[PDB]
Design a protein around this ligand. Sequence first.
Ligand SMILES: *[C@@H]1O[C@H](CO)[C@@H](O)[C@H](O)[C@H]1NC(C)=O
Ligand SMILES: *[C@@H]1O[C@H](CO)[C@@H](O)[C@H](O)[C@H]1NC(C)=O
Lengths: 210, 210, 361, 361, 214, 214
Amino acid sequence: SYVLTQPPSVSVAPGKTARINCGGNNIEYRSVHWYQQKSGQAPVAVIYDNSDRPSGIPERFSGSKSGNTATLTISRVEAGDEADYYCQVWDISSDVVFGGGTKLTVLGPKAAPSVFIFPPSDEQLKSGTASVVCLLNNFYPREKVQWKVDNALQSGNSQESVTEQDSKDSTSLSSTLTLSKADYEKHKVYACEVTHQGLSSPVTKSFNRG
Amino acid sequence: SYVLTQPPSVSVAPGKTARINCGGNNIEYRSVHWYQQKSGQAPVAVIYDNSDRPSGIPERFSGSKSGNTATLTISRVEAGDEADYYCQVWDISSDVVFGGGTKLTVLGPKAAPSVFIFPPSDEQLKSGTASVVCLLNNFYPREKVQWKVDNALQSGNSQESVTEQDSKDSTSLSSTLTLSKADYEKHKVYACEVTHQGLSSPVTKSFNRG
Amino acid sequence: FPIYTIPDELGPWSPIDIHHLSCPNNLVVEDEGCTNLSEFSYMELKVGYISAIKVNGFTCTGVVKHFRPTPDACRAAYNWKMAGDPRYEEESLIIISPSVTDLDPYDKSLHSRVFPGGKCSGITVSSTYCSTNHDYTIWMPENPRPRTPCDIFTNSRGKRASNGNKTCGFVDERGLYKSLKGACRLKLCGVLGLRLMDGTWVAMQTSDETKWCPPDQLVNLVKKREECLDALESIMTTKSVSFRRLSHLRKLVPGFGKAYTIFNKTLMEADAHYKSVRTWNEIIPSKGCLKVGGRCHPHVNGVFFNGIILDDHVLIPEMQSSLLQQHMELLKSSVIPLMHPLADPSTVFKEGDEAEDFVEV
Amino acid sequence: FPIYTIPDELGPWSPIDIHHLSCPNNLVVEDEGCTNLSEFSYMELKVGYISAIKVNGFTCTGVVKHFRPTPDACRAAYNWKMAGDPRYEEESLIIISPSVTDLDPYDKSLHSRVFPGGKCSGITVSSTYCSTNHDYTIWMPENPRPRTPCDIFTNSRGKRASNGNKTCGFVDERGLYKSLKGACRLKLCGVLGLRLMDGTWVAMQTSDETKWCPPDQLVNLVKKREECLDALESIMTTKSVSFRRLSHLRKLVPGFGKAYTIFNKTLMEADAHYKSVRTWNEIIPSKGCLKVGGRCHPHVNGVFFNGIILDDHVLIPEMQSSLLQQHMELLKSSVIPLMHPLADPSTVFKEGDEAEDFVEV
Amino acid sequence: QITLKETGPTLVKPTQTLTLTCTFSGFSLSTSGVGVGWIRQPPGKALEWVTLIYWDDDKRYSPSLENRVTIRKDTSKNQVALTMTNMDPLDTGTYYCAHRQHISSFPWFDSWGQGTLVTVSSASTKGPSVFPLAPGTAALGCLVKDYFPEPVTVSWNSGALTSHTFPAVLQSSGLYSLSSVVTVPSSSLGTQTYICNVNHKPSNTKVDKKVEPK
Amino acid sequence: QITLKETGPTLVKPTQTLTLTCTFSGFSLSTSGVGVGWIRQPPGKALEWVTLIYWDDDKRYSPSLENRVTIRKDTSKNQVALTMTNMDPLDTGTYYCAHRQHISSFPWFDSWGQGTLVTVSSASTKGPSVFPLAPGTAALGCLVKDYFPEPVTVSWNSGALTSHTFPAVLQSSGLYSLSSVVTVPSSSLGTQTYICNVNHKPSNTKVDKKVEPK
Ligand SMILES: *[C@@H]1O[C@H](CO)[C@@H](O)[C@H](O)[C@H]1NC(C)=O
Ligand SMILES: *[C@@H]1O[C@H](CO)[C@@H](O)[C@H](O)[C@H]1NC(C)=O
């Protein structure tokens, strides 16, 4: 299959200019298209045909190409043009192929998370499937949640949900452990480890069965 | 007022003859009438006009008079002709006057009573009027129930009900004490004394507040 | 004691907090030999003025971080908050309604826990604002100039009872014997009426001299009185109320009394004339219907008064805690079921021609 | 688990005592991918023979104070006691009915706790009377000559399910999936049927070979299995039962099971096909009506089956202990009611222009 | 032979008028020598003649009682009426109605209706309060207190229980109380639950009560 | 200007046929240079073009997807239909519908409907199980597990409570679970009772749950 590359997760200096590369075979001859997709929104085209801008896209966004590697440069970056940026071209292989996106990250301020843990209800230890919950809130950056069941690492068994940037702060998540009611009645130390930038030490709140 | 006397409670030897006297002014000239009233039944006339018997009264019953004192003699007494026996005459004072009855008692066998006591319910100690109950059963003769509230005699305050001769045995009663809920909370010894012929010692079952 | 007491007539609701609460007067007086009954008409306090004469106000305080506020400029912002248009913009005066205060029959002073000493002498033309416990915080009324309410009575027709030439009690238009025993005179609107029982205020046409009410009491199974005070103390420690502990503050016998309820986390009280309920059915005849005042009572988000709430099914706290104890009981009743003699594992047979204890002859 | 299980069909009642009782089989088996369903007809044990084949008898003993009795002269007095005319006069033989005993599919022996070893080989032309634990006491049947019952089946129509060419379960005429997993062969009346689940005995027309039932088992939230055994032990110590401890012996899932009840101090059991109940309403729609088998169920002096009794109101032991915990709970719910700031006794004011903590902006 | 049937109000309030009616078959109130009396006997006390009326509307009266009683004949109906004014509570008793033998010169009653039970009390009909009387045999019972219109029907375990209900004594408050008691196996206490079924039809107050030891 | 509206089944079972309909106003599917595409993006993953159809019923197809997708035009209705056969669970995603700019030689989408949320799961509609997550502030919450047809509405103290409901992650059993949590005064615990109101309209399973510390 055709493919064209663009980096995941470029990171910018707010108010500086940014530059994302899209590169694929023979881009020098096809023309390349560029899409901004803000979180949960449908994509909006920012530039098309290499260097043209839609009627309402600001002059800050630009795009240009050299060789088979095209690139859109967002001059004077704001924080709101932080989004997934897809490039896209026609091929012989398909009519339209998209680079797997590039996540522009605009930065700069570092928060910390509060860590509450929630054991499984006596309602759920009567089903046979217990569930332990680790809720963090108000952190930023966003990225590590481990589980210590009798002080022992537990991997491959939890899932995780989160909300997005808060309307006011910009900082949230929910970790969930699944034991069986015999795996709950047989381990005592039940903890939740946490890792973040504002954290000077890896946080953990622990609970025993009683 | 006119009046004519007859003894209460004559007592006979079963199978012997019995004799009840009725006496009143000038009975020698009026004629005197005699009525048997078995327990709860309406009276039946046994003899009339001094010495005559109804069509179905047995020859055992007789009656005769001497002077102003008339008398009905029940020869060869059975136990079923045990009843209240009233005499009755005409006067100037009223048309018909009755001697207050004579209770023939036929005898001979001596029983003993079982004594249960019942404190007042927590339902009744919530009304403010407690009630203590002393139930006896199976005794014969029939005649004395005292109440020891903190070991102290209690008179003038109870009532009493009874049933009659039992269909089979012939032997029953219910004594009832009324304190107020402050008189209950203030005395500890709560007893019931009992006196009867078969009893070799005066019976008493006691209870404290707990 | 009746099985329940339900209102027959319920006044407007007033916001109060947990302190306003207080156990009910459950007193009942018979009148013996008071049986000459004569038809008669009389007056009575309109439900909603019986317990007291409320008079609404508001709380204006000052900020910018405190300053003592000015009345017309506060009054200004009461009117705004009435619409909240140029209100929420805000040098700032912050307004809280409604501040219920009570009208004192004697000195027309206003009472409320907000006031220093718990009294204000009154608002008049020259005094337009009462001062409060907080220095930068004043109180003004809903009215610019409040007026003593004098349309407060109902006309009523009962039968009055007199053991002798002197009369002793009457039966109000809702049929309940009210005894004049224990009543004192109380001057409402220039009429000299009897506060009767729980504040029952009637005015007769016939006047016998009677003792007056003292200027102190002038505003607002005896086990059950202590069963109830426990609930009140239970409430006040926690500063929290429950519909269960709510249903204890109900007048247990018929006659005047306050009823309590709670809306949107806001505690409320109202005047009420209780009627004895002989059977649970006569007040709950339908699935979600509470017969009171001959109709079905409206609920506010499933909440009726006096702990009565709403599965779509009207549950009464005192009714529920009975059926549960009634039913639970029948369900725990026991028996010894018959067993055949020869059906036992261990039945020792006594050898010999000795006949066992089957006593069936 | 369904909220309740009610019978759809209930066999005749049989007298039993507390020993006959036993916790229910609550097992349920899904069959996965068993979705080719084909319409089909088949047979089934008539309700009342499913759990067992009862066979009534009586107890003749001897007195005059014991003597071993003679059968025809006992049989004589069974017929008398049938009318009790020359019976109660009484050298005396005393008769007790009915002695339910069970019919053994394998050796046509009769079982009953009365019998030495708990078995009798059977009554036949030459053996007319079974002997019992008591020497001067014999057992004879209601019949002179009992006959193995062969009119015991129903005709039925379900849909059968087959994941592949081989079939796995079916849906009986009352709509419930029954899985053939776990069933063994059982020969009734010279037909080779499957005992399925709880004894469910069906006979198909299509025959696949299957394992047989052993001659031992041939007659009669897994927490709930232990919640129940406690009730049984609770019963047996006391030798006494309560409608509360009765409602634990109910099959908690739909399918075959015994139902229990008690009449006139006499314990009774009967076969029953349970149906899951989605809502309490569908079984109690009226004031005293228990919908079972599409009609309202008769009660015997206020007693329906399975602890369900009768204020003139049908109360269900499991329903009642729910509403009480459900209602009681809402009634105990709590709140903090709003209080005005300035309305507190102890509200310390911090002197100065320091603005207090009224955060309402 | 002769039969006499009292009829009337079983119950009358003090200071009201009582009026009863003896109806009678075997004999002729229109003959020239017969009479129809009333004898009343307060419960447990001795017989007391009350009035007599003869074929010639001659109305004999007990002297103690003359100022209140009013006797009347109708021999067209075969009925005598007895009418007592200003009923006092002591007048509670059985009122017998009797026939005065007509050949015999001095008067004597040969025939006597099974007499009616007049009870003169002032109490509104009020239901009972039923309290428990708890316990090689032991005994337990119900106390039915403060019932007014007697009689009360006490059933035990739905009258499934077979082995002493007592009569009622008039309390200090013009109300009645009676108590029913049973002997059970001392072993059944705390295993077989015991409930008495009490019904005061007067106020159709039905109450069942569980009676167990503490 | 231009507007495009995806419509179709929000939910489809694996191995069934999905068929969606983009309806569109600003432009002319009957012109000589336009086209209407479908781009789908599985949740959190990168955009993936799916099909395109041009004014001359030329139907471009993504090579990965050609063997299942079926695109169709009707420009009499201003509608395009997308039809995917043999639905597989990975196909869960948002299906955008877009307009291909008609002056520009190499194809690019200028207009893009806010796209529809296709979720391909095999579960019968089943209500939720709502468990409590108990506790200068403390925090408590509800755990709504095993709900299938998303979405679930968690209200707190009758939405009288004002201050984080989470999104749902697909469990190991094709069922969804989401969890709602609140920060209350640490002093209200054990004085103000807290009940979450959960409604799974799919099975109209409404359940309220009391959440308090031990
Ligand atoms: C059985 O119940 C009936 C009511 O139908 C009752 O009359 C009878 O006395 C009961 N049997 C016994 C032995 O009590
Ligand atoms: C008061 O109740 C209404 C419902 O009528 C509700 O919408 C509102 O939010 C409540 N007030 C507050 C402050 O929550």
